[PDB]
Amino acid sequence: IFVYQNNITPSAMKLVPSIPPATIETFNEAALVVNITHHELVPKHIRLSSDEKRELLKRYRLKESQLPRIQRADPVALYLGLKRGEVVKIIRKSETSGRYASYRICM
């Protein structure tokens, strides 16, 4: 994790996905002033294990892409540090059912 102050050089930004399997994540300290997952409208997002995903795709007989999507650059996706393929479990409070478990695939 690299917390930058104002801006990063376009040449320096190219060095971010240059060393796999190691991942580099950049964050502006002004954008980290308030935690987004603490907001009342942001439910509890939980990244699922390769086994938990495997089980979910079996119960509903789903294909990776056939699921609701979460962008790789989505604020919460960037917070948990989601990679393409990773499934996230969303426990959201409904004004009809209460606690409801939904899911999203990061592409």
Partner: protein, 1523 residues
């Protein structure tokens, strides 16, 4: 459709491709070469458009299949084009590949390694693997060929391995996986590829430049010559070629360039043109973009149109003949070209002859395909593209919608004597509408009579179909032949080829048949229900019961309705069990009733169920049989049971309420116990006298023991008697009760009538005295309010000169007049309320129940207490557009009133009533307010037509799957569970009505029979888990949502609600447990819990239910009720359009709701509001004095007289220091730039041009038509689709994607920073003024400085927080202390943590919320914002609908709108083609080589396949005994 004719073969999928020239030449029936269509005499010319080889024409037999005009299907022919032509639909694409390719090495100018990178990514995307396509970009080692070829090898190695690995598992098939997200990733790449392809100038493979290609509107390409820099580049790179061994360009040259390029770049184009893997292994050839031949459609689809006597030539034949003339001409030009040549040199002519030949045939080809691509001829003939998109298009006008057989139309007339589930069919329709009834042993008797009766005697038969397939019409036949055919109906089939079959009788529509009743617009599925046919003799109109009035939204004001007669038993069963009226008691919008009695019946019930209503044995029994007939199957006991009398001695008498008890006792099942309900009435106990309980509706064991029955009981009102009966006994019983009550009250209104008269409008002498006395105080009110707003002590006289001057100030200002109007209105309306409260009802001469005018308003039969008060007391203050009566420039509201009159009457306050009459002044004012409403109905462009049409086309496929999840047409998951609990809205009503369910325990326990279910379900698994989740939930009650335990997720997520008793929503669980704790009451608290658990189980949404259409209908239909204008933020349909239709990132009224802490006071919050609110220089300035003096130089002395320092510091939170910085840095720099610009503008244009013309300053009968004229046309028109967007929507769719030392140093520093100022003195001690001198040149002359300064002051900002204009403090919303911002900037509010709770900061802007807080937060904003639109208009829409809509908008992880843009990411090309731009979506489908899987409702309709929703969500198989 014939059931005797089954089909064994079916179309499973449609493949889009291009016809090859070689393919057309072989299938062609005849080559068309002749432009003439007919020979002399009248026979079709050989080689012409009417050739008999193309099919039978002019009573001649076809020369291909030999059949006549009837049986011949027609045959395709072909035109041989003498030169190849660009196919208009694919010209744009071939153009892209022409500009992207090198003219030397004949490769794309983009580097091969980069091209291979796209080919790799596109191959991996043929299979459903996006993650791998991105992982390819990670594969990395002016660069050597040996190194780059290794990169291509390593990339190809990963592609081959990733495909094989995913192929080994169930990740992708040999045919490849294809999803909308996969399609999104493909569409992105194919776009990026063409963008990179077009960008390259110099070829990356061989460094030589290619000449750029330009294009015009029509299909024609030119070649622009290279520049000297690029020509010298060709020379220096000319030697390396040897070692290896504007002008128009012809169609052949382009084809030849693309021929080599498509061969050399075949690898990438293989995946660029194939959506899924190319299993056919076909070569991607350039000649697919070119047309060497034209297919000639069969004569069958090119027949000449006959209108009366005149036989008009077919427009397609005309366009085809033109192609034929040009082809013969080029054949001659090529023949003359073939002759001669030794003599040449001037070859500029032979190319000029060639260019003309090519451009002429091309134009003729274009004119035939797409007319809007052909040259203007001195309206043109429509092309085949125009034929598919004439108006709404072939797909919308003739596929998605069609004119139908076995259907009728007529004006509807009311009828209370028919059942609520029936339709009164005129005998005219009954003798024409027939059903194909197959003759059998069980119905031979019934059909023999019908056959004898014939086509004019009902119940008869129009025709008889034999087992051989032939038809025998009974129309011309006499009783003798009909009698003979009837005795031949059940004869055994001699033919073994038809022994399986039996004869059919096309019998008249009987009283046992189903019909589909339709009243347009069909805004919701309740506007298309199934009715039971009741043929009524001597009728000329369709008769309909009053209970149906609501659902159809049909008023008997001369309305028209469509009757559809389905022709098979599967369609019958559906119209009787799914779309039938009785199953439509509750609307899915809110789960509330849309069925009930409307006017006479409500007034009849209040009288019949009244204590005063008594009946003798003779009277009582008559009322029972009058509405309940056992012969019509109204009874459940086969004998009319009767209660004993309520009065035994002296005379035997029955009460009115006892009739209601007896009706229920005979219509409800005997096996089930009576209904138990404690409801309320619209009529208060006070009206029925002292100590009455007649408001409390009491039903104990199916007996009305207390209270009368209103609109609140047997009307379309929730939790009434009919609804309570509907929940306990079902929909069939509730329907019987409605029809029974409907008859009873009709019969009761016949024996005991109901009237309204003058006696019901009169006040007593006592009551009228009160009226005059309260209205006597209203004279003072006018001047009192006028003296209050004007601010004058001791209440000055009405003729006061200072007051009259003060009222004038008010007259000239729109805001000041508003304050005066609102104050005077509130005061006179208080006098109105007093009159009404006193006089009604305690002052009315005739009183309830006898006062029918009063009775109708209280019962809810018709009218309200407001209408009653206007009739008997006063009309009140006539309000016009929120204010009072309009006033003239003279200060007079009418020529009768005094200028600036301080009287209530002058302002529009009407003391008069409609009973006594209204004065002429009051009459004119009432005319104003009366018309005002009708004017608003004329100026209302907002329509719900297009809004609903956009939702329905994108949600049609969305339904409930057998795995309880909400899945789209293509199997893609939208929701994991409907509303997170899987409950049907039409069931979720008494599910929380625990007291009701308890009072009816044994009745519901018998309803939800568990004895036949206990062996099929689990009784503990879910119940145990429910306790474990409740345990962890109670542990983290005070804890916040982010810190909450994630150990155990909800019981519904782990256990199937239809299989496990207890897998209930936590909302239901909490509500049920709370009831058992707060209410301790032979039913145990444990056995009741099981019943409610079982009720939830039986309230689940059925798999197959089209929740998509239902949702859009549930948002569309009630959004028609919000077409009216405002009485700041965007409301109604425009706000709903901002969300659903456009998903705007630029909202009209962006806001932020800031929750303030408890430690921050009301004064502190208001100071904070001032601190963020945008402050302008204009807001602090009182006066500006400019003293223009010309001496030596134009000297401008600008003095800024501000308000007092303490005044603006307490009103804007702005200091004197803050004012100094803005003037010294912003204002002077802005003023200097404005003066310089004004000097330039003066010297630029000296004056306007004289003599030269300047621009001007600024359906007819349809706009001149009144409502009765305009509605008379809509009355008969059978709608193609939903309303139309021709309003504001069309303009929204018009957007594409002596001084101190310190003061002297300050002045001197400012002089160095400004080019025109000389002096600068500012009030530093007091802070009241700012003076500065401006020096201009002698050439600058005259200038309007005051106007220049003024404009810059209101443009100068003192303090502004980015994107925020004003922060206000409204009244606490539902107890929550909040601040509403007129702008959006979260990061700025994040810094105000001491005042605002950063974890509760709400915002209406969805896109802004998505950008900062994520997709789930934006999703929650969509469901809340759409709810705000409906809640404001007091419309309740179930959150299950909104959640589905929001989930569909957020399906891609973004914010997609219901429009062409959002739709782009959808599998079905047929669904896309039937939405808009049919030929455009078709072109995209062909180029992708797409396979339409026929899984969307639209696609299935196109190919005639049964829809996969509801009854089509499964298959029916027959169990056969023999092996």
């Amino acid at each position: 459709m014939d059931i005797s004719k089954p089909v064994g073969s079916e179309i499973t999928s449609v493949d889009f491709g291009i016809l090859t020239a070689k393919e057309i030449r072989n299938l062609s029936a005849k080559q068309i070469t002749n432009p003439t269509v007919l020979d002399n005499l009248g026979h079709p010319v050989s080689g012409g458009l009417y050739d008999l080889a193309l099919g039978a024409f002019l009573r001649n037999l076809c020369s291909t299949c030999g059949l006549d005009e009837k049986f011949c299907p027609g045959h395709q022919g072909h035109i041989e084009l003498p030169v190849p032509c660009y196919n208009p639909l694919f010209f744009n694409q071939l153009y892209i590949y022409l500009r992207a390719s090198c003219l030397f090495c004949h490769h794309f100018r983009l580097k091969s390694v980069e091209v291979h990178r796209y080919a790799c990514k596109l191959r991996l995307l043929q299979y459903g693997l996006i993650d791998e396509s991105y992982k390819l970009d990670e594969i990395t080692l002016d660069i050597s060929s040996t190194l780059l070829n290794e990169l291509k090898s390593k990339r190809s190695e990963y592609v081959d391995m990733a495909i094989a690995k995913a192929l080994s598992d169930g990740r992708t098939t040999e045919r490849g996986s294809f999803t909308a997200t996969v399609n999104d990733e493909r569409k992105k790449l194919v776009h990026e590829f063409h963008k990179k392809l077009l960008s390259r100038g110099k070829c990356d493979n061989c460094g030589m430049f290619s000449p750029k290609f330009r294009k015009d509107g029509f299909t024609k390409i030119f070649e622009t010559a290279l520049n000297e820099k690029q020509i010298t580049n060709n020379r220096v790179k000319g030697f390396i070629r040897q070692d290896m061994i504007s002008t128009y360009i012809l169609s052949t040259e382009v084809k030849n360039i693309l021929d080599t390029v498509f061969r050399k770049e075949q690898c990438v184009l293989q995946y660029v043109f194939h959506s899924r893997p190319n299993l056919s292994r076909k070569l991607v050839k350039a000649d697919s973009f070119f047309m060497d031949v034209l297919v000639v459609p069969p004569t069958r689809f090119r027949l000449p149109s006959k209108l009366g006597e005149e036989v008009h030539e077919n427009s397609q034949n005309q366009l085809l003949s033109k192609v034929l003339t040009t082809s013969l001409l080029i054949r001659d030009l090529n023949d003359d070209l073939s002759k001669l040549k030794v003599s040449l040199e001037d070859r500029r002519v032979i190319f000029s002859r060639l260019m003309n030949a090519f451009v002429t045939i091309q134009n003729d080809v274009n004119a035939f395909i797409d007319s809007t691509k052909a040259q203007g001829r001195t309206v043109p003939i429509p092309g085949v593209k125009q034929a598919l998109e004439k108006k709404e298009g072939l797909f919308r006008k003739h596929m998605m919608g069609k004119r139908v057989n076995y259907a009728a139309r007529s004006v509807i007339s009311p009828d209370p004597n028919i059942e609520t589930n029936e339709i009164g069919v005129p005998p005219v329709f009954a003798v024409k509408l027939t059903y194909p009834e197959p003759v059998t042993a069980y119905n031979i008797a019934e059909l023999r009579q019908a056959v004898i009766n014939g086509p004019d005697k009902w119940p008869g038969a129009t025709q008889i179909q034999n087992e051989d397939g032939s038809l025998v019409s009974l129309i011309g036949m006499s009783v003798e032949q009909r009698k003979a055919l009837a005795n031949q109906l059940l004869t055994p089939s001699s033919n073994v080829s038809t022994h399986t079959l039996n004869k059919k009788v096309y019998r008249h529509i009987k009283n046992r048949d189903v019909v589909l009743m339709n009243r347009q617009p069909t805004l919701h599925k309740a506007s298309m229900m199934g009715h039971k046919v009741r043929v009524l003799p001597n009728e000329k109109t369709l008769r309909l019961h009053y209970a149906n009035t609501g659902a159809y939204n049909a008023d008997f004001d001369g309305d028209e309705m469509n009757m559809h007669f389905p022709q098979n038993e599967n369609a019958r069963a559906e119209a009787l069990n799914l779309a039938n009226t009785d199953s439509q008691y509750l609307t899915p919008t809110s789960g509330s009733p849309v069925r009930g009695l409307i006017q006479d019946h409500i007034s009849a019930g209040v009288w019949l169920t009244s204590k005063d209503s008594f009946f003798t044995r003779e009277q009582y029994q008559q009322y029972i049989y009058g509405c309940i007939r056992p012969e019509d199957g109204h009874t459940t006991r086969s004998k009319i049971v009767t209660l004993p009398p309520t009065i035994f001695k002296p005379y035997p008498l029955w009460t009115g309420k006892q009739i209601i008890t007896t009706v229920l006792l005979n219509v409800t099942p005997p096996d089930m116990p009576g209904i138990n309900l404690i409801s309320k009435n619209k009529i208060k106990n006070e009206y029925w006298g002292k100590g009455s309980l007649e408001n409390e509706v009491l039903f104990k064991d199916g007996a009305l023991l207390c209270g009368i029955l209103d609109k609140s009981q047997y009307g379309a009102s929730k939790y009434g008697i009919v609804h309570s009966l509907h929940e306990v006994y079902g929909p069939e019983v509730a329907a019987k009760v409605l029809s029974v009550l409907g008859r009873l009250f009709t019969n009761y209104i016949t024996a005991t009538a109901f009237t309204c008269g003058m006696d019901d409008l009169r006040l007593t002498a006592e009551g009228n005295k009160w009226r005059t006395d309260i209205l006597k105080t209203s004279v003072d009110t006018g001047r009192e309010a006028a003296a209050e707003v004007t601010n004058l002590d001791k209440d000055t006289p009405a003729d006061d000169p200072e007051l009259l001057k003060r009222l004038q100030e008010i007259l000239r200002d729109n805001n000041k007049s508003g304050i005066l109007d609102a104050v005077t209105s509130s005061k006179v309306n208080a006098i109105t309320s007093q009159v009404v409260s006193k006089c009604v009802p305690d002052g009315t001469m005739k009183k309830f129940p006898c006062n029918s005018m009063q009775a109708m308003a209280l019962s809810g039969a018709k009218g309200s207490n407001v209408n009653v008060s206007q009739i008997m007391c006063l009309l009140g203050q006539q309000a016009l557009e929120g204010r009072r009566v309009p006033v003239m420039v003279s200060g007079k509201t009418l020529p009768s009133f005094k200028p600036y009159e301080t009287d209530a009457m002058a302002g529009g306050y009407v003391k008069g009533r409609f009973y006594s009459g209204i004065k002429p002044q009051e009459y004119y004012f009432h005319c104003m307010a009366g018309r005002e409403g009708l004017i608003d109905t004329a100026v209302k462009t907002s329509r719900s037509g297009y809004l609903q049409r956009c939702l329905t086309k994108q949600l049609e496929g969305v339904h409930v799957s057998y795995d309880n999840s909400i899945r789209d047409a293509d199997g893609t998951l939208v929701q994991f569970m409907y509303g997170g609990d899987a409950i049907d809205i039409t069931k979720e009503s008494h599910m929380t009505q625990f007291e009701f369910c308890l009072d009816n325990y044994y009745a519901l326990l018998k309803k939800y029979n568990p004895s036949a279910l206990i062996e099929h379900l689990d009784v503990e698994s879910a119940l145990k888990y429910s306790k474990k989740t409740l345990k962890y939930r109670k542990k983290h009650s005070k804890e916040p949502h982010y810190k909450q335990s994630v150990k155990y997720d909800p019981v519904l997520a782990k256990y199937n609600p239809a299989k496990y008793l207890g897998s209930v929503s936590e909302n239901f669980q909490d509500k049920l447990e709370s009831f058992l704790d707060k209410n301790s009451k032979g039913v145990n608290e444990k056995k009741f819990r099981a019943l409610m658990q079982l009720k939830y189980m039986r309230s689940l949404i059925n798999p197959g239910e089209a929740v998509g259409i239902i949702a859009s209908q549930s948002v569309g239909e009630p959004s028609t009720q919000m077409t009216l204008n405002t009485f700041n933020v965007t409301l109604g349909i425009p706000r709903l359009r901002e969300i659903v239709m456009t998903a705007s990132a630029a909202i009209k009224t962006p806001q932020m709701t800031l929750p303030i802490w408890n430690d921050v006071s009301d004064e502190q919050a208001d100071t904070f509001c001032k601190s963020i609110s945008k402050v302008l220089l204009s807001e602090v300035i009182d006066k500006v004095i400019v003293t223009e003096t010309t001496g030596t130089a134009r000297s401008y002395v600008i003095h800024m007289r501000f308000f007092d320092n303490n005044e603006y510091s307490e009103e804007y939170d702005v200091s004197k220091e803050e004012l100094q910085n803005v003037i010294s840095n912003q204002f002077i720099h802005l003023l200097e730039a404005a003066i310089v610009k004004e000097i330039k503008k003066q010297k630029r244009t000296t004056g306007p041009d004289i003599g030269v013309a300047v621009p001007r300053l600024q359906n007819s009968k349809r706009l001149e038509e009144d409502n009765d004229e305009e509605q008379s046309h809509k009355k008969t028109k059978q709608a193609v689709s939903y309303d139309e967007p021709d309003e504001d929507e069309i303009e929204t769719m018009r957007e594409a994607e002596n001084m101190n030392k310190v003061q002297r140093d300050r002045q001197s520093a400012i002089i160095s920073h400004h080019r025109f100022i000389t002096k600068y003195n500012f009030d530093d001690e007091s802070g009241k003024w700012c003076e500065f001198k401006l020096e201009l040149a002698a050439d600058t002359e005259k200038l309007l400085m005051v106007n220049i300064v003024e404009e810059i002051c209101r443009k100068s900002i003192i303090r502004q927080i980015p994107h925020i204009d004003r922060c206000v403090h409204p009244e606490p919303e539902n107890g929550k202390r909040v601040l509403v911002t007129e702008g959006v900037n979260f990061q700025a509010m994040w810094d105000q943590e001491a005042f605002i709770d950063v974890d509760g900061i709400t915002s209406n802007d969805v896109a802004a919320v998505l950008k900062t807080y994520g997709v789930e937060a934006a999703r929650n904003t969509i469901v809340n914002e759409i709810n705000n639109v409906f809640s404001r208009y007091a419309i309740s829409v179930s959150f299950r609908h909104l959640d589905l809509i929001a989930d569909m908008m957020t399906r891609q992880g973004t914010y997609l709108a219901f429009n062409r843009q959002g739709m782009e990411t959808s599998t079905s090309s047929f669904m896309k083609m039937s939405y808009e731009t049919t030929c455009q979506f078709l072109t995209k489908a062909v180029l992708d080589n797409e396979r339409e899987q026929l899984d969307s409702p639209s696609a299935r309709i196109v190919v005639g396949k049964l829809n996969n929703v509801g009854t089509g969500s499964f298959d029916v198989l027959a169990k056969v005994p023999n092996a």
